[PDB]
Design a protein around this nucleic acid. Structure first.
Ligand SMILES: [Mg+2]
Ligand SMILES: [Mg+2]
Ligand SMILES: [Mg+2]
Ligand SMILES: [Mg+2]
Ligand SMILES: [Mg+2]
Ligand SMILES: [Mg+2]
Ligand SMILES: [Mg+2]
Ligand SMILES: [Mg+2]
Ligand SMILES: [Mg+2]
Ligand SMILES: [Mg+2]
Ligand SMILES: [Mg+2]
Ligand SMILES: [Mg+2]
Ligand SMILES: [Mg+2]
Ligand SMILES: [Mg+2]
Ligand SMILES: [Mg+2]
Lengths: 212, 23, 37, 146, 134
RNA sequence: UGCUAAGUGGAAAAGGAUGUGCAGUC
RNA sequence: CAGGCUGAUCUUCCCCAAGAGUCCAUAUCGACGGGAUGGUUUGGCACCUCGAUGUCGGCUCGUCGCAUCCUGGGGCUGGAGCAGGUCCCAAGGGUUGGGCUGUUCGCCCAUUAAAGCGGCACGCGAGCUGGGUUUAGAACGUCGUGAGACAGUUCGGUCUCU
């Protein structure tokens, strides 16, 4: 169970060893420094905290700067954890270890987490995949509307988890599996097959797949 | 049914002495 | 096996015991097995 | 008129139960008398004079009967088909704190004061407890001979 | 289905249910009978259903008395109609009370006698006992 | 001083059955 | 109209087996008779509402029960195998599109692993439609001396609310 932070760099297409087209989403996982290693004695779990992306020193908050000063590391844009199973896996990390995208090895499977695109208050049709009412044959002002939302005098209420209308996207999501076509060691980019969540240039956590 | 049976078995509460004002 | 509120024996061999709070009859014949008597 | 507490009159002090072999219910009811402050010579219902209770070995409680299979202890979330049920033997293995607690909370008055009573109770799975600074007296549970 | 020949009043009140039977409470005729331990309206259907259950199981031998006769109308109205007059006489019904002997059986064997009556118990509404003349 | 292992107590029938406690009878 | 009680009638199980199954009541059917469950049909009753509880079917959206249509696990078989029958367990998911009719139901068509049964005011009109029913127009058959009448047909017929 290895992992890496990176960014979504946008999509392209690349041709196979057997001449098929695979569509590939290009991510660039840059050099990530492990800042802090969460340990089972003090915390009650095992995890690794990874730092990513260049930031100016003056932008950094003094609370945030002192944490990087404890690590012995130049401060970074984003930081996040890889939760990992058992105690044994944190044995092979040291604070200030600068890991790169070379580890993943061609033909692996991943999870590739990342926050989704916000769609911005879509109701009913777009959000849940409801069917609207008919466009003709009488239909007065109901063409995209939800219809009924409940029974009658019993129960005399709407149930929790009824499907209505509200702000859609910016969900954390996951792709699952999603084959790594090619690790490029120089440049520091991974060609992963298929779509990966989020906008172009959003933060993305690639780790090896739990289902595989 | 269930509601019909249960009302008439409240007759036997000890406070009621084997009769309860049905209706 | 045959369920039903009744059991009754058929063979003289058929035993009528009860297992885990439930009445059953067992006979050499696979057919004469019954439950919830 | 009669005596009512005009604060501070609360002596308070602490107790520490060990369950071990003693059955649920008579532990929980005897705990709930201490938690209201009803053993006290001075008892007014509106105030709480309830002494602290530390229950220990709350996994060991001998439940008796065949309740460790067949008593279910239900929750409902809010949503339709949200009715969960969790056997006492299953519940005691996961959360041994819950079984003694959820008994004792059911015997308290169920009101605005009755929720302030729940702070005084603590309940632990193992033999240890971290309130050994305050020097609690071991309360063995007693019938008065009539 | 046996019925009275010429009943005087074709519409009667309900037969008076509660009370112990004064007679005939004991076996008068044959070796084995069955005595009702409960109040019921034994229809002429249920007598004839119980009568053949003996006669099939007994086969050829023995003899069967019936102390019961139905005699009494018991009214029913149509299922369609609203709740006018009194309806038509539908059933024919003997009033049976606890104590009273219903059926009787003369068959020389012990086991064939008892289990033949046991067929007749299950086809009556009453919860009944097998009795003996001794 | 006894009974009940079924949470029976804390719903129900015609029936079915080596569950068990007492008082009878070859 | 809907709720309430009732459960004759309906509905799902059950007691006793006369039997039919070559023989063999209980693989599978089970007459005659008896005992209950369910409230889902037709009813009985008149308890809430007539200073209004607004209306069948369809669409939209569902939610729960299991008496399981499919998938999953079992016993028995008059179970060789394949494919069944029957009974027990099980509610996680899935249960198609058209033809005719206002229809519900139903008959059919081509498929499907399967085309389940019910409750929720026979779910849902301050969510929609208005084909059906049930105002005023009008003709047809019928009954009426006549005005007119008919859960007899026929064509037309305002759906309010920040
Ligand atoms: Mg559309
Ligand atoms: Mg429009
Ligand atoms: Mg009923
Ligand atoms: Mg009970
Ligand atoms: Mg009504
Ligand atoms: Mg009402
Ligand atoms: Mg009235
Ligand atoms: Mg009003
Ligand atoms: Mg079932
Ligand atoms: Mg409706
Ligand atoms: Mg409308
Ligand atoms: Mg409405
Ligand atoms: Mg119309
Ligand atoms: Mg004329
Ligand atoms: Mg027109």
């Amino acid at each position: 169970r290895k992992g890496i932070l990176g960014t979504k760099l946008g999509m392209t297409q690349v041709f196979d060893e057997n001449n098929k087209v695979v569509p590939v989403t290009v991510v660039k996982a840059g050099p990530n420094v492990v800042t802090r290693i969460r340990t089972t004695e003090r915390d009650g779990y095992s995890a690794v905290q990874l730092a990513y992306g260049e930031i100016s020193p003056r932008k950094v908050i003094k609370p945030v700067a002192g944490q990087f000063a404890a690590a012995g590391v130049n401060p970074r844009r984003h930081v996040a954890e890889l939760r990992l199973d058992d105690e044994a896996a944190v044995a092979e990390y040291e604070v200030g270890q600068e890991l790169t995208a070379e580890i993943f090895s061609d033909g692996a499977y991943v999870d590739v987490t990342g926050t989704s695109k916000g769609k911005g208050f879509a109701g009913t049709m777009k959000r849940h995949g409801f069917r609207g009412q008919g466009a003709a044959h009488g239909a007065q002002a109901v063409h995209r509307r939800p219809g009924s939302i409940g029974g009658c005098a019993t129960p005399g209420r709407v149930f929790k988890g009824t499907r209505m209308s509200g702000r859609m996207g910016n969900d954390r999501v996951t792709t699952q599996n999603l084959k790594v076509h090619k690790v490029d060691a120089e440049n520091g980019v991974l060609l992963i097959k298929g779509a990966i969540p989020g906008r172009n240039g959003g933060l993305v956590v690639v780790r090896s797949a739990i289902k595989r | 049914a269930k509601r019909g049976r249960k009302k008439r078995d409240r007759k036997h509460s000890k406070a009621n002495h084997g009769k309860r004002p049905n209706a | 096996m045959k369920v039903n509120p009744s059991v009754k024996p058929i063979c003289d061999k058929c035993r009528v015991i009860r297992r885990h709070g439930r009445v059953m009859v067992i006979c050499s014949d696979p057919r004469h097995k019954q439950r919830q008597g | 008129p009669t005596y009512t507490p005009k604060a501070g009159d609360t002596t308070r002090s602490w107790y520490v139960i060990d369950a071990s072999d003693v059955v649920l219910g008579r532990l929980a009811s005897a705990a709930a008398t201490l938690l209201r402050g009803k053993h006290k010579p001075t008892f007014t219902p509106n105030v709480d004079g309830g002494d602290f209770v530390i229950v220990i070995n709350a996994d060991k409680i001998a439940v008796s009967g065949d309740k460790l299979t067949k008593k279910f202890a239900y929750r409902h979330s809010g949503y339709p088909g949200g009715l969960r049920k969790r056997t006492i033997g299953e519940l005691l293995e996961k959360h041994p704190t819950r079984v003694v607690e959820n008994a004792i909370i059911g015997m308290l008055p169920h009101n605005k004061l009755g929720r302030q009573i729940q702070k005084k109770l603590k309940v632990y799975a193992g033999p240890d407890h971290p309130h050994a600074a305050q020097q609690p007296i071991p309360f063995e549970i007693k019938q008065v001979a009539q | 289905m046996l019925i009275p020949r010429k009943v005087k009043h074709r519409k009667q009140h309900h037969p008076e249910q509660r009370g112990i039977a004064s007679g005939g409470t004991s076996v008068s005729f044959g070796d084995y009978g069955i005595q009702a331990l409960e109040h019921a309206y034994i229809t002429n259907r249920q007598i004839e259903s119980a009568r053949i259950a003996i006669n099939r199981h007994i086969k050829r031998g023995g003899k069967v008395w019936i102390n019961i006769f139905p005699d009494r109308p018991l009214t029913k109205k149509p299922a369609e109609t609203r709740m006018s007059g009194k309806g038509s006489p539908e059933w024919w019904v003997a009033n049976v009370k606890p104590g009273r002997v219903l059926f009787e059986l003369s068959y020389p064997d012990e086991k064939t006698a008892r289990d033949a009556l046991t067929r007749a118990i299950h086809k009556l509404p009453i919860k009944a006992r097998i009795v003996t003349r001794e």
